[PDB]
Amino acid sequence: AGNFWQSSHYLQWILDKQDLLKERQKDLKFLSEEEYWKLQIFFTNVIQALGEHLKLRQQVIATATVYFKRFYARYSLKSIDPVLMAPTCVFLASKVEEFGVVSNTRLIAAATSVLKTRFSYAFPKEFPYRMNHILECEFYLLELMDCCLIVYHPYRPLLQYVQDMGQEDMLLPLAWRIVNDTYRTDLCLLYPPFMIALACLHVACVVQQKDARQWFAELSVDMEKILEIIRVILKLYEQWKNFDERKEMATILSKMPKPKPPP
Amino acid sequence: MEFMDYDFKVKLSSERERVEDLFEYEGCKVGRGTYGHVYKAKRKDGKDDKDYALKQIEGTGISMSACREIALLRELKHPNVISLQKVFLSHADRKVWLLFDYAEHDLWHIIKFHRASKANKKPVQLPRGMVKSLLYQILDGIHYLHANWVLHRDLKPANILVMGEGPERGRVKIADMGFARLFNSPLKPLADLDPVVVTFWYRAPELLLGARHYTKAIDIWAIGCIFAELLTSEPIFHCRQEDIKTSNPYHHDQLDRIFNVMGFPADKDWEDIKKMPEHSTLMKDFRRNTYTNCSLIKYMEKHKVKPDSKAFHLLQKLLTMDPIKRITSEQAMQDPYFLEDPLPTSDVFAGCQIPYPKREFLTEEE
Ligand SMILES: NC(=O)c1[nH]cc(-c2ccncc2)c1Cl
Numbered sequence: 244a245g246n247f248w249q250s251s252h253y254l255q256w257i258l259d260k261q262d263l264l265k266e267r268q269k270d271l272k273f274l275s276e277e278e279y280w281k282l283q284i285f286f287t288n289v290i291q292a293l294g295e296h297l298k299l300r301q302q303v304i305a306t307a308t309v310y311f312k313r314f315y316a317r318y319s320l321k322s323i324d325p326v327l328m329a330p331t332c333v334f335l336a337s338k339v340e341e342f343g344v345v346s347n348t349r350l351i352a353a354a355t356s357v358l359k360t361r362f363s364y365a366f367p368k369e370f371p372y373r374m375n376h377i378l379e380c381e382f383y384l385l386e387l388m389d390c391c392l393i394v395y396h397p398y399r400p401l402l403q404y405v406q407d408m409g410q411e412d413m414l415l416p417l418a419w420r421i422v423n424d425t426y427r428t429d430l431c432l433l434y435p436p437f438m439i440a441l442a443c444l445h446v447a448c449v450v451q452q453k454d455a456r457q458w459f460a461e462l463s464v465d466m467e468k469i470l471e472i473i474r475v476i477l478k479l480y481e482q483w484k485n486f487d488e489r490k491e492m493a494t495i496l497s498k499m500p501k502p503k504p505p506p
Numbered sequence: 507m508e509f510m511d512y513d514f515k516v517k518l519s520s521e522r523e524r525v526e527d528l529f530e531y532e533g534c535k536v537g538r539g540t541y542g543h544v545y546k547a548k549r550k551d552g553k554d555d556k557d558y559a560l561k562q563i564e565g566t567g568i569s570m571s572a573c574r575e576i577a578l579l580r581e582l583k584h585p586n587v588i589s590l591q592k593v594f595l596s597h598a599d600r601k602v603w604l605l606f607d608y609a610e611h612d613l614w615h616i617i618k619f620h621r622a623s624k625a626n627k628k629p630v631q632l633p634r635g636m637v638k639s640l641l642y643q644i645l646d647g648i649h650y651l652h653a654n655w656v657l658h659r660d661l662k663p664a665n666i667l668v669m670g671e672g673p674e675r676g677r678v679k680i681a682d683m684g685f686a687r688l689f690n691s692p693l694k695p696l697a698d699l700d701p702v703v704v705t706f707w708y709r710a711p712e713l714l715l716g717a718r719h720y721t722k723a724i725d726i727w728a729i730g731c732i733f734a735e736l737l738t739s740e741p742i743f744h745c746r747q748e749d750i751k752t753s754n755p756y757h758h759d760q761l762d763r764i765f766n767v768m769g770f771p772a773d774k775d776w777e778d779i780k781k782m783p784e785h786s787t788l789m790k791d792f793r794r795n796t797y798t799n800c801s802l803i804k805y806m807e808k809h810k811v812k813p814d815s816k817a818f819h820l821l822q823k824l825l826t827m828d829p830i831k832r833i834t835s836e837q838a839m840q841d842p843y844f845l846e847d848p849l850p851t852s853d854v855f856a857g858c859q860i861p862y863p864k865r866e867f868l869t870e871e872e
Pocket of ligand 1: 664
């Protein structure tokens with residue numbers, strides 16, 4: 244956990260954008276690119292809601308989200324039902340991040356109540372899986388991620404950066420919230436977390452009309468990659484405005500490829 | 507409920523690497539413990555002739571111990587930390603198997619062999635070049651772990667493996683991440699999510715006085731315990747098991763043994779002892795005067811380790827009661843003990859004949 248450049252995250256799970264888009268083609272016969280992105284946001288929101296119900300800290304939710312994104316970056320939406328995968332990712336992340344093993348009753352109650360209370364526009368029927376399904380999906384999730392469990396996030400480097408600036412109280416809460424928002428995109432699959440952090444800090448400086456051009460100039464980082472991430476962030480807030488998940492998600496879910504049954 | 511695509515499922519099952527197809531290990535068990543079982547195994551294809559270790563993890567599914575061992579060993583890479591080669595997941599029984607290079611030896615068996623000699627009026631102490639080389643490589647491995655934010659938390663002779671004849675002859679491998687944590691791992695208000703522990707010989711005094719933090723200094727104490735046991739063949743803080751197990755941190759008899767060896771710390775030796783959660787229990791149960799003639803000097807002197815030796819002076823810095831006054835791994839590696847003749851060697855057996863018996867196979871019903 245101390246060295247990103249030697250990590251499985253860096254060496255296996257920083258993916259090329261073109262390969263990522265190439266893999267997704269299998270699912271895009273059913274969904275537009277736009278609808279695929281919406282579905283990814285939706286499931287990010289589902290995982291955030293599951294984590295909130297279980298009272299898990301943000302790092303656990305973030306790790307779960309990365310497992311979900313990694314899984315469907317390699318495999319089809321129809322390979323394993325994402326409705327099972329989302330709580331399975333939370334279950335595994337809780338172990339990895341040292342919260343512990345969520346009890347049978349708490350996990351199923353969380354999935355049931357969350358979909359019922361907060362996502363009933365997309366889920367007319369109750370959560371249909373039991374704990375045995377979670378456990379079975381957990382084994383599959385573990386092997387299919389090649390046993391890569393330690394995930395680096397932008398929160399730690401963000402904190403170090405704001406502290407280096409001497410602007411913790413001023414910039415942190417906005418920058419942190421922007422980091423949360425980046426989980427609505429593919430950025431965690433595409434860029435080192437410190438670069439995501441810098442981009443988020445930058446957007447927060449823009450929003451708060453804080454000039455910090457000097458401090459950013461004194462960093463030895465690929466500014467062109469940072470600018471790429473900044474453009475993704477600005478773009479996610481335009482998509483946010485235009486997306487109504489409550490009005491749109493039922494139709495998008497019905498277009499999602501479903502697992503072929505056994506013959 | 508069919509959550510998985512049929513075509514995906516059949517393809518996965520077709521191509522899945524299965525431990526029992528790839529390795530021969532039946533009747534080849536060589537260890538058992540709270541961790542599970544270890545087998546000495548051979549490849550079922552003829553493609554290589556190496557010995558492998560297969561660790562069958564205790565219990566069903568992904569326990570907390572299974573999870574942290576897989577998570578951490580997946581990331582780590584250093585000549586003194588056991589390297590995880592493969593993880594096999596057996597879906598039918600939900601059993602987890604870990605694959606490693608086979609280590610013929612470990613410190614538990616090495617120390618046992620010497621202790622048995624002394625007890626046989628046919629005495630052999632551990633050679634002093636070997637002792638030093640082992641310590642150096644232990645320190646090297648833990649320094650790498652610490653640098654990468656990993657605390658081991660269960661250092662003890664059985665967890666210090668040594669490679670036998672082959673390309674890594676005499677190399678130390680630190681094993682068993684079942685108790686490990688990151689510096690920043692959350693503190694769980696109730697029990698530590700670890701396997702059950704019944705003996706506490708390697709456990710730093712601050713833990714026995716109820717300190718809740720994960721620290722590098724805790725591993726350093728345990729390594730001090732190991733160094734002493736290598737110098738004398740005896741576990742320095744050996745103590746009987748308690749009749750009545752409880753999960754609380756305070757263990758009276760273990761502390762008593764420690765004070766019998768080290769003496770009872772004076773106020774100036776460990777100022778923050780008064781801040782330990784169990785400090786008033788300590789004041790209730792103990793009187794410092796009981797230990798007035800006890801010290802590490804007197805203990806080690808009885809076991810033929812000279813107190814003016816560089817080895818003794820290093821040992822004393824590792825076995826310092828106050829964790830903040832305990833030497834770090836990197837400073838220990840810089841100690842002049844390691845510059846004194848003989849230098850530590852990368853093969854701890856220094857090219858000489860290995861007298862240690864190979865592990866025997868465990869054939870009992872469990
Ligand atoms: N408790 C453990 O994890 C453990 N203990 C001993 C081994 C082993 C490894 C490799 N060769 C022989 C034995 C392992 Cl793995």
